[PDB]
Structure 1
Amino acid sequence: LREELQLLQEQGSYVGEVVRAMDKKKVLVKVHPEGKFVVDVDKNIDINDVTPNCRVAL
């Protein structure tokens, strides 16, 4: 319970979807109400374990 406030407090979040996934170790995501952004891959999800048009959390 103690830990939950720390996890819970965060800058926020966004929901985007992978438009395209590179071979440069960046992923093309469009966040739904804003424009497109090119961003580095995380530990959990990267190019080999993603297929495009899969909604992904940020």
Structure 2
Amino acid sequence: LNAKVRLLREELQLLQEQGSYVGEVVRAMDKKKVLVKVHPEGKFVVDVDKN
């Protein structure tokens, strides 16, 4: 129950964090870089997270 309320008490904190874009991959290259386009936009190199 403590766990639950703690999560909810931290809920309004985590919801303060802004949103996350969606993207469509095309291909990747070396040194953990990936080419992804945004949907009506251009193509970005993105470094992948360690997970």
TM-score if structure 2 supplies the norm length? 0.65
Following TM superposition, by how much is the alpha carbon of 1:2 offset from its aligned partner in structure 2, in angstroms?
1.2
**RMSD over aligned Cα, in angstroms?**
1.4
SS of the equivalent of 1:13 reads coil
Following TM superposition, by how much is the alpha carbon of 1:19 offset from its aligned partner in structure 2, in angstroms?
0.9
* Greater fraction of residues in strand: 1
Question: Given the superposition, is the C-alpha separation of residues 5 and 33 from structure 1 closer, same or farther in structure 2, using an over 3 Å criterion?
Answer: farther
| Structure with max Cα Rg | 2
* Greater fraction of residues in helix: 2
Percent identity, aligned pairs only, is 100
Question: Which of 1 and 2 has higher RCO (CA within 8 Å, sep 6+)?
Answer: 1
TM-score if structure 1 supplies the norm length? 0.59
Q: Distance in 2 between matches of 1:21 and 1:11?
A: 27
Unaligned runs of 5+ in 1: 44-58
